[PDB]
Design an enzyme around this catalytic site. Structure first.
Site, short mmCIF file in Angstrom:
data_model
loop_
_atom_site.label_atom_id
_atom_site.label_comp_id
_atom_site.label_asym_id
_atom_site.label_seq_id
_atom_site.Cartn_x
_atom_site.Cartn_y
_atom_site.Cartn_z
N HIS A 1 -14.97 -73.32 -44.29
CA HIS A 1 -13.82 -72.85 -45.06
C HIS A 1 -14.23 -71.80 -46.08
N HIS B 1 -15.77 -70.35 -54.40
CA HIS B 1 -14.58 -70.81 -55.11
C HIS B 1 -14.35 -72.31 -55.00
N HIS C 1 -10.06 -83.80 -52.34
CA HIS C 1 -8.98 -84.00 -53.30
C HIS C 1 -8.89 -85.43 -53.80
N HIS D 1 -11.35 -79.15 -60.34
CA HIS D 1 -12.53 -78.73 -59.59
C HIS D 1 -12.83 -77.24 -59.72
N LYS E 1 -4.90 -69.86 -48.56
CA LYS E 1 -3.90 -70.43 -47.67
C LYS E 1 -4.02 -69.86 -46.26
N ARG F 1 6.39 -55.44 -47.71
CA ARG F 1 7.45 -54.50 -47.36
C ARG F 1 8.77 -55.25 -47.28
N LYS G 1 11.14 -55.56 -45.34
CA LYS G 1 11.56 -56.20 -44.10
C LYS G 1 10.78 -57.47 -43.78
N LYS H 1 10.51 -47.99 -46.92
CA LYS H 1 9.87 -47.01 -46.05
C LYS H 1 10.10 -45.58 -46.54
N1 LIG Z 1 8.15 -44.94 -30.02
C1 LIG Z 1 8.05 -45.99 -29.22
N2 LIG Z 1 8.13 -47.27 -29.74
C2 LIG Z 1 8.03 -48.35 -28.94
C3 LIG Z 1 7.85 -48.19 -27.57
N3 LIG Z 1 7.78 -49.41 -27.00
C4 LIG Z 1 7.92 -50.34 -27.97
N4 LIG Z 1 8.07 -49.71 -29.18
C5 LIG Z 1 8.26 -50.40 -30.47
O1 LIG Z 1 9.62 -50.34 -30.84
C6 LIG Z 1 9.78 -49.98 -32.20
C7 LIG Z 1 10.94 -49.00 -32.31
O2 LIG Z 1 10.42 -47.76 -32.72
P1 LIG Z 1 11.30 -46.42 -32.86
O3 LIG Z 1 11.53 -45.84 -31.49
O4 LIG Z 1 10.58 -45.40 -33.71
O5 LIG Z 1 12.73 -46.84 -33.49
P2 LIG Z 1 13.09 -46.93 -35.06
O6 LIG Z 1 13.20 -48.38 -35.48
O7 LIG Z 1 14.40 -46.22 -35.29
O8 LIG Z 1 11.92 -46.21 -35.89
P3 LIG Z 1 12.05 -44.70 -36.43
O9 LIG Z 1 12.22 -43.74 -35.28
O10 LIG Z 1 10.80 -44.34 -37.20
O11 LIG Z 1 13.24 -44.61 -37.35
C8 LIG Z 1 8.47 -49.34 -32.63
O12 LIG Z 1 8.08 -49.78 -33.90
C9 LIG Z 1 7.45 -49.76 -31.58
O13 LIG Z 1 6.55 -50.68 -32.13
C10 LIG Z 1 7.76 -46.91 -27.04
O14 LIG Z 1 7.60 -46.75 -25.83
N5 LIG Z 1 7.87 -45.81 -27.87
N1 LIG Z 2 8.25 -60.92 -36.55
C1 LIG Z 2 7.47 -60.22 -35.72
N2 LIG Z 2 6.29 -60.75 -35.34
C2 LIG Z 2 5.51 -60.06 -34.52
N3 LIG Z 2 5.71 -58.85 -33.98
C3 LIG Z 2 6.89 -58.35 -34.37
C4 LIG Z 2 7.81 -58.94 -35.22
N4 LIG Z 2 8.91 -58.12 -35.40
C5 LIG Z 2 8.64 -57.07 -34.67
N5 LIG Z 2 7.43 -57.13 -34.02
C6 LIG Z 2 6.85 -56.12 -33.15
C7 LIG Z 2 7.83 -55.51 -32.15
C8 LIG Z 2 7.19 -54.15 -31.91
O1 LIG Z 2 6.14 -54.22 -30.94
C9 LIG Z 2 6.63 -53.79 -33.28
C10 LIG Z 2 7.54 -52.95 -34.14
O2 LIG Z 2 7.55 -53.47 -35.49
P1 LIG Z 2 8.88 -53.51 -36.34
O3 LIG Z 2 8.60 -54.00 -37.70
O4 LIG Z 2 9.93 -54.30 -35.56
O5 LIG Z 2 9.36 -51.99 -36.35
P2 LIG Z 2 10.75 -51.22 -36.42
O6 LIG Z 2 11.21 -50.77 -35.10
O7 LIG Z 2 11.72 -52.11 -37.19
O8 LIG Z 2 10.38 -49.99 -37.37
P3 LIG Z 2 10.51 -49.54 -38.90
O9 LIG Z 2 9.17 -49.92 -39.53
O10 LIG Z 2 10.82 -48.09 -39.00
O11 LIG Z 2 11.61 -50.43 -39.47
O12 LIG Z 2 6.37 -55.06 -33.94
N1 LIG Z 3 -3.55 -85.62 -50.05
C1 LIG Z 3 -4.11 -84.45 -49.75
C2 LIG Z 3 -4.57 -84.18 -48.47
C3 LIG Z 3 -4.60 -82.85 -48.05
N2 LIG Z 3 -4.69 -81.86 -48.99
C4 LIG Z 3 -5.79 -80.89 -48.82
C5 LIG Z 3 -5.73 -80.24 -47.44
C6 LIG Z 3 -6.14 -78.80 -47.70
O1 LIG Z 3 -7.28 -78.47 -46.94
C7 LIG Z 3 -6.46 -78.75 -49.19
C8 LIG Z 3 -6.09 -77.44 -49.87
O2 LIG Z 3 -7.08 -77.18 -50.83
P1 LIG Z 3 -6.69 -76.71 -52.32
O3 LIG Z 3 -5.57 -77.56 -52.86
O4 LIG Z 3 -7.90 -76.76 -53.23
O5 LIG Z 3 -6.18 -75.19 -52.14
P2 LIG Z 3 -5.27 -74.48 -53.26
O6 LIG Z 3 -5.96 -74.58 -54.60
O7 LIG Z 3 -4.98 -73.04 -52.90
O8 LIG Z 3 -3.93 -75.37 -53.28
P3 LIG Z 3 -2.49 -74.67 -53.13
O9 LIG Z 3 -2.47 -73.83 -51.87
O10 LIG Z 3 -1.41 -75.72 -53.04
O11 LIG Z 3 -2.25 -73.80 -54.34
O12 LIG Z 3 -5.77 -79.84 -49.76
C9 LIG Z 3 -4.21 -82.15 -50.26
O13 LIG Z 3 -3.76 -81.26 -50.97
N3 LIG Z 3 -4.23 -83.45 -50.70
FE LIG Z 4 -10.51 -73.20 -50.87
#
Ligand SMILES: Nc1nc2c(ncn2[C@@H]2O[C@H](COP(=O)(O)OP(=O)(O)OP(=O)(O)O)[C@@H](O)[C@H]2O)c(=O)[nH]1
Ligand SMILES: Nc1ncnc2c1ncn2[C@H]1C[C@H](O)[C@@H](COP(=O)(O)OP(=O)(O)OP(=O)(O)O)O1
Ligand SMILES: Nc1ccn([C@H]2C[C@H](O)[C@@H](COP(=O)(O)OP(=O)(O)OP(=O)(O)O)O2)c(=O)n1
Ligand SMILES: [Fe+3]
Ligand SMILES: Nc1nc2c(ncn2[C@@H]2O[C@H](COP(=O)(O)OP(=O)(O)OP(=O)(O)O)[C@@H](O)[C@H]2O)c(=O)[nH]1
Ligand SMILES: Nc1nc2c(ncn2[C@@H]2O[C@H](COP(=O)(O)OP(=O)(O)OP(=O)(O)O)[C@@H](O)[C@H]2O)c(=O)[nH]1
Ligand SMILES: Nc1nc2c(ncn2[C@@H]2O[C@H](COP(=O)(O)OP(=O)(O)OP(=O)(O)O)[C@@H](O)[C@H]2O)c(=O)[nH]1
Ligand SMILES: Nc1ncnc2c1ncn2[C@H]1C[C@H](O)[C@@H](COP(=O)(O)OP(=O)(O)OP(=O)(O)O)O1
Ligand SMILES: [Fe+3]
Ligand SMILES: [Fe+3]
Ligand SMILES: [Fe+3]
Ligand SMILES: [Mg+2]
EC number: 3.1.5.-
Lengths: 457, 457, 456, 457
Positions: free
Chosen positions: D54, D93, D102, D120, D191, D231, D233, D402
């Site tokens: 860890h 840490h 704990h 601790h 975490k 961000r 979103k 953005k």
């Molecule tokens: N550009 C592009 N994006 C893709 C494609 N396939 C999947 N994606 C995903 O789809 C998301 C949509 O992207 P965009 O086409 O740029 O649409 P948008 O949300 O309007 O983003 P902006 O054009 O920057 O405003 C992207 O973030 C990609 O991760 C692809 O073929 N081309």
């Molecule tokens: N919650 C999610 N977890 C994992 N992948 C995600 C998630 N949401 C979107 N994705 C994937 C889908 C696409 O492959 C890629 C695009 O990211 P996303 O944040 O959805 O961009 P977007 O199209 O909204 O663009 P913009 O940043 O301009 O808003 O990330």
């Molecule tokens: N009764 C128990 C059993 C489980 N955990 C243990 C499981 C995790 O591995 C650990 C987390 O370690 P720390 O509490 O020291 O970590 P943080 O200080 O970041 O705690 P937190 O994330 O709540 O701020 O606690 C616990 O809080 N007490």
């Molecule tokens: Fe720790």
């Protein structure tokens, strides 16, 4: 004869010969070309799976659940006939899906044929009937033990519900009607199957564990009617399952880019509706919207129409071709803004067509040189819930205690935790713009903020 | 602006704006409809992935490898121009495949145009040139720092080969040509992506780890040739990689049913040829076999042809329609027998037509009621090897020691272990019986052993 | 008391009340404090799992295989008593391990009591006897249809070998190769090893025992019912053996792990005749002598390492210094290994004579600092497929889909020509106690002279 | 000499020689014999991991986050010294954890020495100082590039806190103070590490994805000081992260059996106290409770004390030995019931020692079979919240848009969704019994029910 098929999600699926005979039909093999996520494939490049493996997994899970329930309780009198019927019903629960899955029945059909109410379960039932009557499956059914007269009705009822209003099985077998699809609280093997498959394919980690739920399942006599119970110490697991469903819908299913791509694809389909001919039964010719009337023409209605329109050369398909080419160049409809989760108003389906006019009619306090019409605004309404329209699904689940496993009890929300959401439904309004130049986007943003202020959102 | 795409295999991926510009063209977007395996999808129901994500992953891996190599050794003088060129080359390496991937150029083209030598790498080069010329990308390349007159030649050399033969880069950067495709020993990111994606999707487990290889990779100065050298303890990892490749090929790529399904599909395509037309550049008309000579016609040639033939109604396409219908009913051609790895048999390219004939030419002293004809057979030869023309590629892998990491040495097969395979290649012969009659099946059995056991071929 | 246990490798494991009653005993709970990989935890930080979960998983897998076999062929007449006995035998098959598991019976006992031939399966049988006698399990065994006289002998024969078997008749011979297979090595123990070690170490596995279980039959061979495999799944077996060899080479035969085990064994040897372990009747036993009393052997775990490390007595000084040197990563140096050649195999009797050979060698240039043979440690490692160069899959009987009831043995040439050419190897490693930087060059010159002198 | 180690969670992670020298110390190697979950090992058999991995993973994650943030913004003037200091702070840490992690500082010290407040983190600071002074690391730090006088104070401030309040770094480098341990909100790499590790070892699947969060991280200028903003979103992802934390706590960390086992171990330790002698500096003997006053005695205080008490022979330790034996035969303290979680009232830590007296003082209407004293009951208080004692952690997180990336905004819970929890803290009370026979269990349940109904929930 006992075939074995390898699935990336589950292990090795053991297939009965009757299921193998049913599967080797054109109607079932049609599912190989209908994608699970229509517009979501252009955002997630890993969601390229179809409904074939989905149906296989749903049937496998239904069989596993019924086998476990029969094994742990020998007094329910479950035979191989019931297991086969449940597996058949779970195998053919999505035969009625159209092109791009839910897009066909949620965006295109209401916009093209607003005088008909059509869901995909009705299509599934009709397609199953067509398959049975066309491929000569009944003699096999009497060969392997099934009695078609009531078994066909039982399988039909397992998909669309009643049409104790049931007729396939008697009252003491009610727990067989809540496996493939549950009409009471929406817990079924279908949800588990697509949870696992979508999480595996998209690249998003899952949370729910259905095996633990199966390990702690039982049948109770709840209101003189047998139904599946759950262990009382898994209420948090059910709440986490519903939270996972909400998270999946929020992250993947309701993506803005995917939604607008679905909208543009539906627009192209609408524009290319009166120029596509499909051959039906007896040499009849149908259309894309009319193909849901004859199954011989609906069998050849798959995702190939997209490439048929895209690769065409006919002068009457120019507009749809241009729309698709704009799709392939990423000249997508721009996104203006989203209203906050609606304060208090519910917008019904018939009110969807009036919103762009309201958005365009709004007069900003500051005059804009650019003018916009009602035809250049896309208004989209999203609904988020737990599947019960503001109701708590857990209020319809029955729990039992280890001390007395033959009695069922009800658990309220206040007895679980105080860290649970207060409401179970939501609405989100999204506005898109067609014009792409910066001035039009600025004008559309002004129009949107003025409209949002005017209607008190 | 920078873009992020999620990958179920490689996770989140970063994209340069030039890469985004290249990706959003029809020539690249056609890969969304070409499958990675082809006929294996009808054996493994979870092999529906396409080549779009394959190209994305190959480009990502090439970029990562170049970045790591440049970071560890700063004296190699690796600039952003080279990284962009390598990423572009890796992104557009499988651009020239056709319907059903290796089925096309493996079976259909040689069996329809025997007088032309065509491979998908030359088609990829032509497609890349067409993509660059038909979309106006050179000004963008100049804007981002890429000199097209040298960088395009460098990319083409990385794609197809030498055509010091190389002219894109001086001899100092001789290690940059062994990243996307390696012709010395076969180690490149393409195989890594193949293994990862195929094992994730099919349900098979692989033990190769490319991250460890990247960590210990180094550039060693072999005589007048800078080359990528592994580490002395990575010999076991390399042997495990080759064993995993062999197991993957044997398990998946050469299945009994997948190959015969590919053969039946190729037969249907050959029967349907001369009745399917594709419009080229200038209004000209082409066919499936002649499409490779025009890039505009080739762009509209994907797996859509399968469903175009399957759903057709023209009387000219009855035979191909019936073949596809037989595919859909799982009425496949039957298996005759396994010819075994007999020995010296090394059937070459020249033996292509007369092998099927000499299986029914035997005259055993057995009276058979049914007489079997020689016009209905399919015979194929599988090249089971390491991809190094029946040789061990370990002798082509450089290494380095801790004391002298800038000096390259070679470790032979003897110094590693005595449990390595004695021979690195073998050839198998598979024969198929188009006829399915039960009596003919027994007739084919007797006529099989006579050709194999008595003639010892 | 049907209980459920969640395991990271398998799913939720069900337990018969008899298994739960047997588990909640001091002898079985002793397994919580013995390391699976012993000294490999000091090279791989993720290798911290114990034998408790391994025993649970082995029992679960044995029960699963027996249930599958009974389900497939209803004519074998397999009852609940048989599956219960197989599960019990798979549960208590590792009760005899000592501190650091394999290290104890691999290095300590031969070097502490050379006159005693002792393996851990005998210790497992003794511990099972002690547990059954002390915890009053026999009435509980009788309460579920088990006859202690026959069934206890059956479990003992399953754990350690002996038609010599007396627990079950000769028509039930297929029940004797499930938990442990001395014949070729196809059993559930290797499956559990592969799965757990790949999950914990961080290495990717290649075997899939579920497909093997799906394609398992009982086909009679030489008037002896046996578990049979499908004719077209021999490549899976070859991949399994390749995976076993790769896992052994990668993890089990690491240089640093071996030298750490050597240091721990040296510390244990030097710290003997001072540590007192209490036995029955108030007797005192040593670390090596405690293997003669089970009650004293129960209280012997990895706690001895920390007892020596944290000790304050002046009699255990040298062992504490060795453990401290371990704690600072001032480990013994590595000069170099040999290569497989010469066809001669170094056996146990030559272990002590090997170090003197390198010291007695005369280098070309005299060394200012003399080298003695009393500070050399030489280790020899044997790599094989579980046999003495014998083909492992030659005694396994296959079957064909056309005729399942009949067995057709498959040779090695029918499979392919892409197969290994041997089933046994050897390696020799040399370690020097004196880690001073001055002797790094001197040690190498002495080492290279010995290999040439002995014609390596 | 960048050493490489292999992690089952991460990949192959590199280590600086300074970290190598710091790790190879008795004070750091002491962490190999302290468990991560303590009493949860007896409920989840797979949770046998320690704090060593860890700590290594937390150091690696802190280094990676700092490197990524520096690469995104080259104007932050991040140097190698700051990265190394953050890595050292993350590595060390948790040097102050006692036996069973704990359990020690949550149950034993508050009960053994009620008059002293100990955490601790103070122990970690003391252990770090002891390690640095005893192992002679200061000349090594001077040689490599660190200045001990400022960097030691910086590391100490990063570990425990301020003790502008900070002094190690100026105000324009304020974003480095919330990486390893964040006080403004509960977002840190600690975490991110134990989430994944506990999920991998417990058999539960994680939901959060820290790589996506690292992708969208940026440094703002909020309240005239640099901070770290996500961000706009990515708010739902943070809500899901906190929900995942709560779910992990509920499912694993507050299990009834684990808590009762920890209580029994604490009781055994308290009884065994005043009979164990630990030698510190100068030959002095320290008890278990007073060993926190000397780090030389604290270095030898690990889980070995448990087996020392269990395997004891002296008659003085008979009671603790009997308690441990009772544990080993699985004869645990029984269970009675819960109380409904509800706010508007809380039980302070001062009242912890008075609740069993109140429970035993209840007056059931119907006379029971056996009278129960105040020593026959165990009362446990569980505090479950989001980590800020009814506050909303998301209200303290800054976001950016953005369009304008350098402007930091704030988001209200109403702008996100209507399906979020309304409260952020709750409390429960658990009642146990020290007897096993049925009559005592029935009497205890009656007394508990009467007490629960006495105070009018
Ligand atoms: N550009 C592009 N994006 C893709 C494609 N396939 C999947 N994606 C995903 O789809 C998301 C949509 O992207 P965009 O086409 O740029 O649409 P948008 O949300 O309007 O983003 P902006 O054009 O920057 O405003 C992207 O973030 C990609 O991760 C692809 O073929 N081309
Ligand atoms: N919650 C999610 N977890 C994992 N992948 C995600 C998630 N949401 C979107 N994705 C994937 C889908 C696409 O492959 C890629 C695009 O990211 P996303 O944040 O959805 O961009 P977007 O199209 O909204 O663009 P913009 O940043 O301009 O808003 O990330
Ligand atoms: N009764 C128990 C059993 C489980 N955990 C243990 C499981 C995790 O591995 C650990 C987390 O370690 P720390 O509490 O020291 O970590 P943080 O200080 O970041 O705690 P937190 O994330 O709540 O701020 O606690 C616990 O809080 N007490
Ligand atoms: Fe720790
Ligand atoms: N029947 C059938 N099998 C499928 C299908 N899809 C994948 N498979 C798998 O592919 C394998 C090949 O089976 P077949 O196509 O029937 O080939 P075969 O085994 O030689 O035919 P038989 O000897 O009659 O069983 C099967 O074992 C299935 O597991 C499908 O749609 N139908
Ligand atoms: N008995 C037992 N259970 C274990 C052990 N290790 C993990 N467990 C799990 O921990 C859970 C705790 O169960 P118990 O110890 O019986 O305590 P309990 O919850 O009060 O169960 P009951 O006393 O039977 O009502 C069990 O369900 C097991 O699944 C073990 O070594 N022995
Ligand atoms: N130093 C060190 N290495 C560890 C530790 N735990 C696991 N390892 C791994 O074990 C391997 C052995 O490292 P060393 O003990 O330094 O052995 P070595 O590599 O021969 O030492 P050198 O010859 O000086 O390089 C390292 O590569 C680490 O990856 C640890 O606690 N300390
Ligand atoms: N939510 C969970 N998810 C996964 N594993 C769990 C969960 N809760 C408990 N486990 C594990 C811990 C144990 O290894 C095993 C048994 O847990 P559990 O079902 O809670 O038994 P128990 O003995 O505490 O309860 P009960 O006696 O009421 O059935 O399952
Ligand atoms: Fe479905
Ligand atoms: Fe490729
Ligand atoms: Fe074992
Ligand atoms: Mg439903």
């Amino acid at each position: 004869t006992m075939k074995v098929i390898n699935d990336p999600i589950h292990g090795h699926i053991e297939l009965h010969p009757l299921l193998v005979r049913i599967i080797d039909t054109p109607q079932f093999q049609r599912l190989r070309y209908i994608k699970q996520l229509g517009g979501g494939y252009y955002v997630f490049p890993g969601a390229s799976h179809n409904r074939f493996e989905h149906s296989l997994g749903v049937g496998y899970l239904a069989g596993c659940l019924v086998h476990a329930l029969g094994e742990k309780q020998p007094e329910l009198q479950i035979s191989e006939r019931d297991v086969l019927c449940v597996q058949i019903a779970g195998l053919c629960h999505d035969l009625g899906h159209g092109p791009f899955s839910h897009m066909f029945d949620g965006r295109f059909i209401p916009l093209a044929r607003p005088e008909v109410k059509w869901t995909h379960e009705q299509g599934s039932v009709m397609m199953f009937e067509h398959l049975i009557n066309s491929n000569g499956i009944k003699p096999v059914m009497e060969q392997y033990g099934l009695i078609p007269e009531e078994d066909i009705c039982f399988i039909k009822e397992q998909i669309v519900g009643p049409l104790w209003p049931y007729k396939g099985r008697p009252e003491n077998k009610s727990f067989l009607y809540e496996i493939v699809s549950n009409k009471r609280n929406g817990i079924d093997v279908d949800k588990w199957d697509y949870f696992a498959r979508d999480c595996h394919h998209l690249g998003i980690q899952n949370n729910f564990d259905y095996k633990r739920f199966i390990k702690f399942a039982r049948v109770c006599e709840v209101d003189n009617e047998l139904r599946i119970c759950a262990r009382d110490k898994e209420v948090g697991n059910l709440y986490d399952m519903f939270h996972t469903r909400n998270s999946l819908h929020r992250r993947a299913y309701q993506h803005k880019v995917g939604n607008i791509i679905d909208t543009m694809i539906t627009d192209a389909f609408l524009k290319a509706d009166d120029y596509i001919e499909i051959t039906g039964a007896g040499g009849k010719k149908y259309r894309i919207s009319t193909a849901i009337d004859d199954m011989e023409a609906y069998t050849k209605l798959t995702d190939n129409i997209f490439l048929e329109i895209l690769y065409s050369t006919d002068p009457k398909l120019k507009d749809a071709r241009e729309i698709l080419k704009q799709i392939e160049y990423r000249n997508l409809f721009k996104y203006v803004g989203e209203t906050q989760p609606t304060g208090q108003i519910k917008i019904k389906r018939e009110d969807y067509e009036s919103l762009p006019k309201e958005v365009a009619s709004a007069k900003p306090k500051v005059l804009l040189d650019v003018k916009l019409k009602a035809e250049d605004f896309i208004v989209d309404v999203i609904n988020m819930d737990y599947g019960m329209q503001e109701k708590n699904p857990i209020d319809h689940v029955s729990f039992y205690c280890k001390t007395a496993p033959n009695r069922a009890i009800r658990i309220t929300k206040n007895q679980v935790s105080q860290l649970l959401p207060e409401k179970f439904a939501e609405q989100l309004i999204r506005v898109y713009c067609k014009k792409v130049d910066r001035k039009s986007l600025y004008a559309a943003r002004q129009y949107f903020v003025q409209w949002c202020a005017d209607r008190n959102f």
